[PDB]
Amino acid sequence: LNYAQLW
Amino acid sequence: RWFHPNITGVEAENLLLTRGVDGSFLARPSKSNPGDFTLSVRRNGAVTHIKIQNTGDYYDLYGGEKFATLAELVQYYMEHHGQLKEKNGDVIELKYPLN
């Protein structure tokens, strides 16, 4: 599962 | 009913890929943080997952605006399409709740 890295 | 209490990350990808469109999203239980939630969002035919922090004092996306409830966090990002952005700067849009 690809978890986004934000900001 | 974007909130799916019953499903895993894997099942969320399957649902979004077969009954959703680009922009479709849902929220579900976090595997890696028992008791917490995660957004699963479809974009460009693939699914990204975004952890929601619940500190007990507010909800947020481990950063950004703070909310008293999860529904108000969801609402805010459905209304403010430019505010949810990756490390590399591309936008993730919560457009269409997958009910």
Side-chain angles (χ1 to χ4, degrees), chain B residues 77-84 86 88-97:
Chain B
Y77 287 113
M78 289 184 63
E79 292 179 347
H80 299 79
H81 278 340
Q83 277 328 271
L84 195 56
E86 273 172 325
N88 65 115
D90 293 301
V91 207
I92 300 153
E93 322 262 66
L94 263 41
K95 296 192 185 168
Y96 313 125

Side-chain angles (χ1 to χ4, degrees), chain A residues 1-4 6, chain B residues 28 48-50 86:
Chain A
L1 308 197
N2 170 45
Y3 276 78
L6 273 13
Chain B
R28 63 178 176 75
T48 302
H49 311 264
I50 302 161
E86 273 172 325

Side-chain angles (χ1 to χ4, degrees), chain B residues 24-30 32-81:
Chain B
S24 294
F25 73 90
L26 50 90
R28 63 178 176 75
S30 185
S32 74
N33 303 227
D36 287 344
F37 309 100
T38 297
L39 291 172
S40 291
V41 189
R42 182 174 156 165
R43 66 144 168 198
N44 299 141
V47 173
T48 302
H49 311 264
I50 302 161
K51 302 174 85 128
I52 293 162
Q53 186 179 209
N54 174 7
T55 57
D57 295 302
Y58 58 80
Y59 288 83
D60 76 353
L61 295 185
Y62 288 93
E65 174 112 346
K66 296 173 166 49
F67 303 97
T69 64
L70 175 56
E72 171 213 333
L73 178 153
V74 173
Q75 179 180 24
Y76 174 93
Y77 287 113
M78 289 184 63
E79 292 179 347
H80 299 79
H81 278 340

